[PDB]
Amino acid sequence: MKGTIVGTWIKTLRDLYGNDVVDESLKSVGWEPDRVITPLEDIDDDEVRRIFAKVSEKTGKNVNEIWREVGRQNIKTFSEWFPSYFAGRRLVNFLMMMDEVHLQLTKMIKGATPPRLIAKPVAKDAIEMEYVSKRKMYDYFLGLIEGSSKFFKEEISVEEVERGEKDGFSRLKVRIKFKNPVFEYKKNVWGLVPR
Numbered sequence: 001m002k003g004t005i006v007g008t009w010i011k012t013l014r015d016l017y018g019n020d021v022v023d024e025s026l027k028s029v030g031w032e033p034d035r036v037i038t039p040l041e042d043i044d045d046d047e048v049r050r051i052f053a054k055v056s057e058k059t060g061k062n063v064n065e066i067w068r069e070v071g072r073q074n075i076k077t078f079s080e081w082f083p084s085y086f087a088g089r090r091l092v093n094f095l096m097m098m099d100e101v102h103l104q105l106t107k108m109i110k111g112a113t114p115p116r117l118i119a120k121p122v123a124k125d126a127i128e129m130e131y132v133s134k135r136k137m138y139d140y141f142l143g144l145i146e147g148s149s150k151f152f153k154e155e156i157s158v159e160e161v162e163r164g165e166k167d168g169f170s171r172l173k174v175r176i177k178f179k180n181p182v183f184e185y186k187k188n189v190w191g192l193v194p195r
């Protein structure tokens with residue numbers, strides 16, 4: 001995985017989740033020393049896998065929930081570190097850029113393997129999002145979405161539409177329903193218009 005994002009995981013992981021004791025043992029004493037790189041440096045793997053397991057072991061939490069919770073708070077952590085993307089959007093626009101954004105992030109960033117996050121309006125109060133990846137981080141994906149609902153303060157329901165595997169990738173499609181509709185029909189204009 002890439003250096004930066006792994007930054008947040010540890011940040012968000014200690015920021016509010018268990019203490020510096022629970023994870024600073026898996027972290028600066030799981031097997032490794034205290035601190036990733038940051039700039040755009042690379043990192044390892046599968047060690048995130050086992051620190052997360054030892055956090056699940058360490059707290060009383062299934063590891064999938066650890067992941068989800070990270071995703072929730074990791075949206076503020078994201079908001080804190082370098083938040084050009086937040087300024088000026090409602091929830092929807094923000095989700096819909098996320099694909100373009102994950103690509104850009106990887107454009108000139110060799111080796112990067114970010115997910116695909118294709119969204120599509122399906123109703124005055126609903127979009128559909130599809131996560132596609134060789135990793136199956138379904139829980140982190142769900143959390144981010146809820147973490148977003150919280151930061152932008154717009155209530156939602158999320159529901160799984162389907163899931164599958166195609167050409168070696170894992171997919172998960174969800175339907176995100178908004179409390180207050182985010183699209184509208186405009187008079188002589190076809191289709192759901194971003195109200």
Ligand code: HEM
Pocket residue numbers: 001002005078085095098101102105111112113114115117131133134135136137140141144145148
């Ligand atoms: C709601 C918004 C987001 C969702 C749903 C989301 C979802 C995800 C997921 C599930 C992963 C790892 C998935 C995989 O390939 O297994 C990922 C990784 C990452 N995300 Fe996001 N993310 C979001 C927001 C952000 C934001 C705001 C940033 C920074 C602007 C960001 C940058 C990254 C990067 C760089 C990675 C890892 C790329 C790599 O592996 O090299 N994401 N995202």
